[model samples]
Target: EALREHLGTLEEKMKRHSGLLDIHATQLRTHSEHLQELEATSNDGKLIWKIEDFRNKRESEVKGHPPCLSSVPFHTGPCGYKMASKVYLNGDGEGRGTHLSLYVVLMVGDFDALLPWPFRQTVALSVLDQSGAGNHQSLSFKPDLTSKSFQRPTDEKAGNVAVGFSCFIPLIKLEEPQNATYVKEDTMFVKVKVDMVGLEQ
Candidate 1:
């Protein structure tokens, strides 16, 4: 009877933990969704993209059924140019199987009419190192006026061409001693910034 009582108490503890797990899971999901909403609505010309479930997403991406991981549209300001970002975890085109690819897309904006044609803002992208060592990987580019991607959006369909580096960062560099905290806890962060120095309002 003593053993039976111990077993009963153990079962109760397990059951209680199970309920707690469920509650925590629900809270986690809600918190994640709330964060996404907040990130998507930033009007600043910068986006700090939180890439969660990195291992799973990279695996899926490499399997050839990759999902389009794109940041929600963001503006340079309340009435500035609109844009977003896209990333290919397994790289893309020329960088396929070897690097991480990243791109910027100009979206049709509410204030598009006021912006200039041939987008000329300097764009910068970076992978933040989670480690306090301050090791961050980054790249920047100025839009080529000749590329259709730089042109102002005449229509929704025509405004979305992505322009960026196919070989943003070598895949190998994201692992081992070469990379310190680029990926931590199965999560990574990518930041995009637009240089508005010479932008015409």
Candidate 2:
């Protein structure tokens, strides 16, 4: 009889959690639909696309993550920068829900004269913190000679020229309250920094 009582309580807890999860899952799908009509805006030379709805976006059921990009006509001329969503992007090691991976892409546009092929550059990405604690996290990488990021932009297609994290931050860690995720007003920020190192390799 004691075992039966404990089982009943456990079942109730499971059901309660399931209800909450369902609500959140539904919310994400709704948000995804709403954002479909959204248009991407632009900034000047110092372009940094800050992404909102970062937490809910890390969902598999919602199709794919949205892309935020750099300005079309940079101060110098044409600078190509974009973020692409890949569901299977390896994070820490290619497991499910291990990461909300964003691939930073180098694209080729009309201004080949200014930014030529076989380009070399340094890039950095940041997850902005809104809590004012000044504890925002940063990720920066340099492209080696063999890396695609180091290579020139052959085609604008994703996975063509780039290096991306198999994992950024875990979805569970972002959602769990104890982790102190920098989500505020259902949004998080991403800062992309590019160092203008042309042919320095």
Candidate 3:
């Protein structure tokens, strides 16, 4: 026998090298929790965006499943201008189901070709009242230098292309209660500002 087929090909290559070392320890704990969530994000241009379980993620986006919700990449300082923030919750494409949409994405920047293109900055979006009842809930825009979502990010795996308000906020007046609490324990924040004073350069 070939040494019992060479010990069965060395125990089948040591069980596929112990299953590739447990898939490289689960890809290094998923890239170390995506680099500790990009080093705890927020480079300055502000970003709150929490929205944890909010009624089981708006009851799984009102049955449609993942009708949008994003936010992580952020910046406007440590080299300025990379952004994120998008939500639908049960709305999209012209306020899909009675509104609650909001957007803002322009990611793709390791110093986006030395910055400066269509991005005119002047974005603002709020929704944090958590009951202290200052009544927070805002929206601001101004950056459509000819659409394409403020261009200048020829897709580094798809970025740039997301303007705002598909009639943001209305889904039954966000569970009315005089419209202020804005979801508490189930979590919900949503901030995202980015004026950066007279920006452009």
Please tell me which predicted candidate would have the highest lDDT against the true structure: 1
Task: Estimate, for each residue in 60-178, the C-alpha lDDT of model 1 and write its tens digit.
Answer: 98676755577767777778888878899887789877888999888898887888787778899898999978779889987877899887765684457888999988888875446
TM-score, one value per model:
0.76, 0.56, 0.33
Worst ten in a row by lDDT for model 2: 68-77
Q: Write the per-residue lDDT of candidate 2 for residues 1-201, one digit (tens) a residue.
A: 799999999999999999999999999987875464233333222334455445455443344543322222222223443323232322424533556554465554445555554545565666667777766656777667766565555565443443556466666655453535666777766555665444555
TM for candidate 2 is: 0.56
Clashing residue pairs found in predicted model 1: none
Candidate 3 lDDT over residue span 17-81, tens digit each = 99999999999998997896687677888878777888888888888668688887888777877
Q: Any runs in candidate 2 off by more than 4 Å, and if so which?
A: 1-46, 53-56, 60-96, 157-159, 177-180, 197-201
Q: lDDT (CA) for every model shown?
A: 0.82, 0.52, 0.80
lDDT of 1: 0.82
- List all candidate RMSDs to the true structure: 10.0, 15.5, 14.1
Predicted candidate 2, C-alpha RMSD:
15.5
Best by TM-score: 1
26: Cα error in model 1, Å: 22
Candidate 3: give the clashing pairs: none
